[PDB]
Design a protein around this nucleic acid. Structure first.
Lengths: 53, 603, 80, 108, 30
RNA sequence: UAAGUGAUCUAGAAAG
């Protein structure tokens, strides 16, 4: 959470999203559902100001 | 010096201001207060602060101490006495003076006779409590804010960043920051005018007293004179008077309307540099303003049209065939050529024009706003950096969008954050002002001299104090200034030679860093190294033109058998970290306070 | 143990991070302990009240220097 | 001093005045090569992207004809054509034959 | 428009009275 | 197409 906060503060939100989009991001941003598992990641990222969840 | 018309105008202005505020004046203090005792306790404490350190005391000092003691003994009686004095006493004991020797600029030290001094203290404290309670001094006035000078600077930077679309250079958007000093702001306050002004804000008796206190006989070394014209800084309350006078100047600068906006509505005032709306913020050119202690900081955010108008009016008024006026410009000489304010015929003209306008705005008889004591920085298409000094910093603000390549944000750089997006929108590189460096050097010199009598431990203690002051005040900003680094090494070595000279040794082998940097507990000295630092010594001829990445490290305070003495700078939380951290922890506190409220508990 | 102490001293003795980085590079530390050095640096960072630009700059410099240090920083991250 | 970079001299400074080159200098020496991927990405992001031509074509065309004329001149001046009539006649022929061919071109 | 709303809208042979001297004193007192 | 060569001041006696 702290790390992400730092990143956002430094780079920017949309920019950050773009950057991560370019990368793989398996554990952070899984696309293959895995049965109410994205819920978890999604939930956690709703805790901080993040979009696209 | 004041033309009576000018005085009248001033009066009209101030009257208009308080009219707009519904500012109820401060009464003459009766026996009513629950705070009275508390107020008294503050003044006494302040006074005591002088005497707690120095054990051997003068006769005057002794008397003062006695008075303080008695006052503690007989609080109500003391209060009564004070009240009586205020009602009656308009002729005081004359004020002895001396000059403390800061080796650049010797500073006058007024020494009021203890009995009146108590009165001055109590009156002062009361005035501040009443003023702040009644919202006399608007947010924009800097020094008294209950925020630290570096903190203040940081806040200013934040404000600058958080202005709506301030860094745009697209639609001919042109920013200008105007630093200038209100020259002799206190030193030509007429008592007549001052008296009348005060009679607006407080009960006339208090005003009468204060005016009568500035009118003292200034004894110095066998020569005296009645101080007929000119406020004395060295009274206790005089600060308040100065601040109040400052308000007048501020109003003159901003006018009733813009000032009114900055303050906000009287019932619900603005926070420091906030605005009720965006529209209001954007309405005027004068987007921000602050008078830190006879040194105003007007920030203008012009449009191309407005700028053109300004240049026009000025240039027409004060013509010049060539560029010409680029010479005789108050640039920031500490910074490097392509870092500091570039000299564009247009931008420079705007800057000068702006300064002229400001000068016109304030009447000359009231104070000296000389260009020579005024730095004007400009931000534009052709000027990407934006400079100023404040509280003895030098701050080069540079927005992220204008930077060619945002490197790993170095140390001694404040990344400023935009309030809306929460992104690091702008950087603020930090140097220490030359003036502050000079002051520091003077301090070191002072320490050095009057130390033939003084013992090594005491010397080192003084030096330690000096160093900790220098850092703990501007911590992060030492990284940049190579001259300051030099001073630190040079100064530190001089101190070491005071010991080494003291032993008539003055020699490298026989004073290994054991003796100096080891604490007083272990027979050492407790000297605090800001020395064994590697001094970043980049290419001096290039460095003058542009900032370089530090390439070559010089050896600062060296030694044979070099044990890596840690600095002090690493063990002080650098300001930016301190401030982000502060924001976090205070937020947390706020949240928990709410929790406590909800839960109905003592947090 | 004493190596660690030395490293710490090198960190402290610098003014800004760059100086520290320079000092560390001068140390001539072999590929063996680079990871250990990085760990030490991290721990030192942790010890402080807050995150410092200093340490970040130092990290950057070292990273830039040689691929081995990049690897070390990575593996340290993994460890963390 | 050394390469515009040493201390003016060790007297004064109150120190060795020893002058190391930093080893972050290698980082400042090659940050474009080290952080080439920073700009590379950016570049990639924007990496996808008549009258004059006509004029050129015209020049080529007329020019060709003029080359024919020149050739005629060569043939004449070299191989038995001392008179001016020969030259002029040749030119005329070129104009007729050339602009005939080029009229054909126009038609197509 | 904005510039209207203000209050004010539009050698000697004495070493103790030299322009240099007064200026100097101003400089070196505070 | 991806490292580390190098610049190293002083310096103690008298009288006050």
């Amino acid at each position: 959470k702290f790390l992400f906060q730092e990143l956002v503060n430094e780079l920017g939100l949309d920019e950050l999203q773009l950057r991560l989009n370019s990368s793989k991001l398996d554990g952070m941003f899984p696309l293959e559902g895995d049965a109410e598992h994205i819920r978890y990641s999604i939930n956690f990222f709703t805790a901080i100001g993040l979009g696209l969840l | 010096e004041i033309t009576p018309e000018e005085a009248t105008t001033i009066f009209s202005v101030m009257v208009e201001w308080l009219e707009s505020r519904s500012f109820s004046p401060i009464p003459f203090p009766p026996l009513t207060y629950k705070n009275d005792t508390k107020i008294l306790v503050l003044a006494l404490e302040d006074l005591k602060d002088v005497y707690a350190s120095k054990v051997r005391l003068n006769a005057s000092e002794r008397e003062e101490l006695a008075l303080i003691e008695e006052a503690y003994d007989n609080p109500h009686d003391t209060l009564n006495r004070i009240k009586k004095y205020l009602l009656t006493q308009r002729v005081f004991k004359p004020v002895d003076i001396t000059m403390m020797e800061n080796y650049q600029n010797i500073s006058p030290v007024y020494s009021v006779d203890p009995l009146e001094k108590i009165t001055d203290a109590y009156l002062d404290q009361y005035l501040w409590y009443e003023a702040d309670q009644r919202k006399l001094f608007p947010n924009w006035i800097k020094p008294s804010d209950s925020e630290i000078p570096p903190l203040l600077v940081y806040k200013w930077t934040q404000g600058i960043n958080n202005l709506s679309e301030i860094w745009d250079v697209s639609r001919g958007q042109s920013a200008v920051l105007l630093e200038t000093t209100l020259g002799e702001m206190a030193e030509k306050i007429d008592f007549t005018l001052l008296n009348r002004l005060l009679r607006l804000i407080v009960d006339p008796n208090i005003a009468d007293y204060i005016t009568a206190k500035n009118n003292v006989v200034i004894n110095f070394k066998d020569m005296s004179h009645v101080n007929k014209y000119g406020l004395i800084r060295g009274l206790k309350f005089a600060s308040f008077i100065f601040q109040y006078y400052g308000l007048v100047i501020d109003l003159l600068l901003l006018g009733q309307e813009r000032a009114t906006d900055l303050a906000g509505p009287a019932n619900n005032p603005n926070e420091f540099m906030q605005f009720k709306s965006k529209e209001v913020e954007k309405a005027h050119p004068i987007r921000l303003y602050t008078r830190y202690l006879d040194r105003i900081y007007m920030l203008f955010h012009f449009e191309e049209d407005e700028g053109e108008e300004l240049t026009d009016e000025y240039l027409a008024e004060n013509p010049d065939p060539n560029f010409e006026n680029s010479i005789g410009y108050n640039n920031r000489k500490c910074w490097p050529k392509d870092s500091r304010m570039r000299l564009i015929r247009q931008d420079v003209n705007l800057g000068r024009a702006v300064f002229w306008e400001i000068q016109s705005r304030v009447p000359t008889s009231l104070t000296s706003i000389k260009w020579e004591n005024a730095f004007v920085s400009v931000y534009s298409k052709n000027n990407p950096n934006l400079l100023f000094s404040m509280c003895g910093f030098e701050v080069r603000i540079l927005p992220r969008q204008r930077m060619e390549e945002v490197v790993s944000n170095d140390e001694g750089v404040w990344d400023l954050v935009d309030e809306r997006t929460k992104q690091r929108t702008a950087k603020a590189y930090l140097k220490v002002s030359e003036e502050e460096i000079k002051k520091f050097d003077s301090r070191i010199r002072g320490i050095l001299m009057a130390s033939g009598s003084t013992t090594f431990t005491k010397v080192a203690a003084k030096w330690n104090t000096s160093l900790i002051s220098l850092f703990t005040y501007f911590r992060e900003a030492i990284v940049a200034t190579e001259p300051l680094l030099d001073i630190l090494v040079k100064g530190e070595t001089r101190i070491q030679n005071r010991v080494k000279l003291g032993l008539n040794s003055k020699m490298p082998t026989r004073f290994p860093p054991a003796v100096f940097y080891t604490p007083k507990e272990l027979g050492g000295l407790g000297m605090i190294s800001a020395s064994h630092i590697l001094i970043p010594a980049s290419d001096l001829s290039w460095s003058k033109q542009t900032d370089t990445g530090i390439t070559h490290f010089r050896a600062g305070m060296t030694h044979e058998d070099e044990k890596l003495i840690p600095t002090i700078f690493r063990y002080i939380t650098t300001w930016e970290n301190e401030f982000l951290d502060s924001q976090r922890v205070w937020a947390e506190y706020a949240t928990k306070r709410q929790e406590a409220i909800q839960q109905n508990r003592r947090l | 143990v004493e190596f660690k102490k030395k490293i710490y001293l090198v960190l402290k003795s610098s003014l800004s991070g760059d100086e520290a980085a320079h000092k560390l590079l001068k140390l001539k530390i072999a590929n063996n302990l680079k990871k250990s050095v990085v760990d030490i640096i991290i721990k030192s960072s942790l010890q402080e009240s807050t995150f410092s630009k200093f340490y970040s700059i130092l990290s950057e410099r070292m990273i830039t220097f040689h691929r081995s240090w990049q690897t070390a920083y990575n593996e340290t991250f993994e460890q963390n | 001093s050394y390469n515009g970079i040493g201390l003016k001299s060790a007297k004064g400074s109150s120190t060795s005045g020893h002058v190391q080159r930093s080893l972050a200098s290698n980082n400042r020496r090659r940050p474009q090569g080290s952080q080439q991927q920073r700009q590379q990405r950016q570049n990639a992001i924007k990496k996808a992207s008549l009258a004059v031509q006509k004029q050129i074509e015209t020049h080529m065309e007329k020019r060709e004809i003029e080359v024919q004329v020149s050739e005629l001149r060569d043939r004449l001046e070299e191989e038995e054509t001392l008179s001016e009539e020969q030259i002029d006649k040749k030119c005329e022929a070129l104009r007729a034959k050339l602009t005939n061919e080029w009229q054909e071109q126009q038609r197509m | 428009s904005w510039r209207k709303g203000t209050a004010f809208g539009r050698y000697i042979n004495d070493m103790t009275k030299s322009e240099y001297h007064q200026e100097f004193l101003h400089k070196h007192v505070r």
